[PDB]
Amino acid sequence: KWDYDLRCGEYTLNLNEKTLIMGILNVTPGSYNEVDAAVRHAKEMRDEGAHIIDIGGESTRPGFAKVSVEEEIKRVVPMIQAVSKEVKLPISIDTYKAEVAKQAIEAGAHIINDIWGAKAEPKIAEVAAHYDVPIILMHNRDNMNYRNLMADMIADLYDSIKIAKDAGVRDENIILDPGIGFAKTPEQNLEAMRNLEQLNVLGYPVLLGTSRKSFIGHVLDLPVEERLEGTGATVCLGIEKGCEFVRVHDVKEMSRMAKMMDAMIGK
Amino acid sequence: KWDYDLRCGEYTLNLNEKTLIMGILNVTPGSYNEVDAAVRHAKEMRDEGAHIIDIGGESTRPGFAKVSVEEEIKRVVPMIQAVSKEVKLPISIDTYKAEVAKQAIEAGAHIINDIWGAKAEPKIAEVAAHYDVPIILMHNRDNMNYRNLMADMIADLYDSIKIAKDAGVRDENIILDPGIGFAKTPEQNLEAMRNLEQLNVLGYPVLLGTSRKSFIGHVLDLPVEERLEGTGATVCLGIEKGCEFVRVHDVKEMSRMAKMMDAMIGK
Numbered sequence: 001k002w003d004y005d006l007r008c009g010e011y012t013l014n015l016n017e018k019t020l021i022m023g024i025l026n027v028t029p030g031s032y033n034e035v036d037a038a039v040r041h042a043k044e045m046r047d048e049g050a051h052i053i054d055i056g057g058e059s060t061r062p063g064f065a066k067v068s069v070e071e072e073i074k075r076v077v078p079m080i081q082a083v084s085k086e087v088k089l090p091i092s093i094d095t096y097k098a099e100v101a102k103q104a105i106e107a108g109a110h111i112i113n114d115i116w117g118a119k120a121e122p123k124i125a126e127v128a129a130h131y132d133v134p135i136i137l138m139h140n141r142d143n144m145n146y147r148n149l150m151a152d153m154i155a156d157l158y159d160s161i162k163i164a165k166d167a168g169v170r171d172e173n174i175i176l177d178p179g180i181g182f183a184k185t186p187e188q189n190l191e192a193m194r195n196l197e198q199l200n201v202l203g204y205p206v207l208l209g210t211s212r213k214s215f216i217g218h219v220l221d222l223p224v225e226e227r228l229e230g231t232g233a234t235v236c237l238g239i240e241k242g243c244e245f246v247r248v249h250d251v252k253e254m255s256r257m258a259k260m261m262d263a264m265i266g267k
Numbered sequence: 268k269w270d271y272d273l274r275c276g277e278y279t280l281n282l283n284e285k286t287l288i289m290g291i292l293n294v295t296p297g298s299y300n301e302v303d304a305a306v307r308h309a310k311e312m313r314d315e316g317a318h319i320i321d322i323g324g325e326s327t328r329p330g331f332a333k334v335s336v337e338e339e340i341k342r343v344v345p346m347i348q349a350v351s352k353e354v355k356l357p358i359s360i361d362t363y364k365a366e367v368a369k370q371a372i373e374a375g376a377h378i379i380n381d382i383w384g385a386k387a388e389p390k391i392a393e394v395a396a397h398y399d400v401p402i403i404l405m406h407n408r409d410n411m412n413y414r415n416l417m418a419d420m421i422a423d424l425y426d427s428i429k430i431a432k433d434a435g436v437r438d439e440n441i442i443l444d445p446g447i448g449f450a451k452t453p454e455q456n457l458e459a460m461r462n463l464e465q466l467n468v469l470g471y472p473v474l475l476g477t478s479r480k481s482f483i484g485h486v487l488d489l490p491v492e493e494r495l496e497g498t499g500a501t502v503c504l505g506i507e508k509g510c511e512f513v514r515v516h517d518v519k520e521m522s523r524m525a526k527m528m529d530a531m532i533g534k
């Protein structure tokens with residue numbers, strides 16, 4: 001179906017063979033204890049079937065505390081250098097800032113993961129263009145007053161493509177994400193899942209990030225630690241509705257579900 | 268969507284509100300220890316969200332040892348009487364025999380579950396007609412030489428409807444089952460899952476039975492006890508492709524997945 005592979009640097013990721021698992025790595029206090037914990041977690045997630053490792057923090061997570069520019073660098077960079085050498089998998093850096101994104105690739109990160117899809121700092125997309133690296137553009141907005149959810153999401157996403165393409169970003173580096181849990185009531189979150197196949201008309205791979213999110217909590221009436229089964233249902237629907245990547249905490253469980261989905265749907 | 272509820276005796280099961288969980292109860296050695304274990308398991312499965320309890324044995328499970336007529340009765344009947352009184356849920360009896368099926372309802376069973384869809388003993392469908400009780404007709408055959416899997420399954424299933432309807436069985440008591448793991452290579456099992464939505468044109472509710480089955484094992488390369496995630500993927504696809512009931516061992520986990528699927532698909 002996809003006439004190209006996802007080329008990054010040392011590793012080639014094939015989009016037709018299977019659903020790609022992206023394992024989540026949270027980094028919230030460069031001491032030994034934090035960098036070692038992060039490495040051990042990545043090894044674990046590698047051993048359980050992760051294809052990409054995702055490295056972010058306290059900005060970009062509810063709270064959304066606007067922590068400092070130089071601060072993000074000294075936290076995330078040692079993390080990348082260590083994971084890159086010990087763990088033979090591509091890495092994405094979860095940031096909405098060009099400045100940070102910049103260091104991250106130079107320290108060895110491969111994919112950019114922007115929860116603001118270049119609207120925070122359009123300069124990020126120039127960084128993307130220049131090192132020639134896949135960039136994930138997530139739907140997000142600073143309000144959530146939709147005329148029409150899906151139509152507005154596709155419009156918003158397209159506003160992101162436009163920023164990337166104009167920067168020089170080649171199509172084959174774009175990847176989109178419906179931004180589950182961002183600027184969306186819990187009902188809107190469900191609608192987006194129900195209509196996920198609409199993002200496919202845009203012609204770019206899609207990544208889904210629903211792991212343990214609160215709309216799962218809203219439905220099941222369950223706290224974060226009991227959300228594994230409900231995360232599973234969201235990963236299955238997503239694969240069936242055409243997603244290429246899933247971002248998850250529970251690499252082991254999700255990896256089995258994805259591999260059974262792939263076999264059933266014919267991937 | 269369904270203009271009727273599933274009427275049985277004391278309990279009414281609604282087909283539009285949610286996916287119905289049918290919990291599996293295996294009974295393979297009327298001593299106290301077996302009947303007490305069976306009751307405790309049913310209470311557990313009730314507490315975890317089961318809507319129906321399913322009571323069968325060594326016939327109807329690989330092995331398929333052709334154990335005795337009077338033998339099935341004295342094993343399964345005490346089981347039903349006890350579960351019926353302690354546990355306020357409808358019960359199905361997993362048998363392919365009229366004789367047995369007969370006792371089962373009289374002892375308090377509500378639904379008939381025939382893995383041979385009335386082709387073993389067409390007389391079973393007369394039992395169904397007479398007590399006015401939902402009957403599940405599963406696809407099965409004594410060979411597995413398909414001209415065309417789905418077309419043959421729909422033809423075979425229709426051969427079962429014909430036997431039931433002629434007996435007097437009202438449409439609103441029929442329920443069909445694609446018979447996953449029966450007379451089907453593991454690849455055929457996957458195809459059937461991939462095309463499950465085709466059974467819907469027949470106009471009857473569908474029940475899916477894929478729990479921990481070996482085609483899940485074939486894909487994941489995993490023994491029976493590590494098949495929970497892969498069972499989950501099959502339950503999710505099934506719900507999305509329109510099934511009304513799922514037959515499962517892990518009532519807790521599946522129940523959460525089904526409830527998250529229901530919310531996403533709009534059920």
Ligand SMILES: Nc1nc2c(c(=O)[nH]1)N=C(CNc1ccc(S(=O)(=O)Nc3nccs3)cc1)CN2
Binds near residue numbers: 063179208215247
């Ligand atoms: N590509 C991509 N990257 C991501 C994504 C994502 O979905 N896609 N999500 C987060 C995590 N942010 C997040 C976590 C939980 C929720 S929530 O729905 O559960 N809401 C709340 N969580 C805690 C308090 S309120 C919302 C956003 C970080 N990076």
Ligand SMILES: Nc1nc2c(c(=O)[nH]1)N=C(CNc1ccc(S(=O)(=O)Nc3nccs3)cc1)CN2
Binds near residue numbers: 381382447
């Ligand atoms: N309505 C309905 N009723 C049922 C069903 C069913 O699917 N639907 N399945 C069984 C269980 N039979 C079964 C269990 C496992 C497999 S298998 O695919 O895993 N094969 C084998 N299992 C063990 C050795 S070979 C096949 C059939 C009993 N009753």
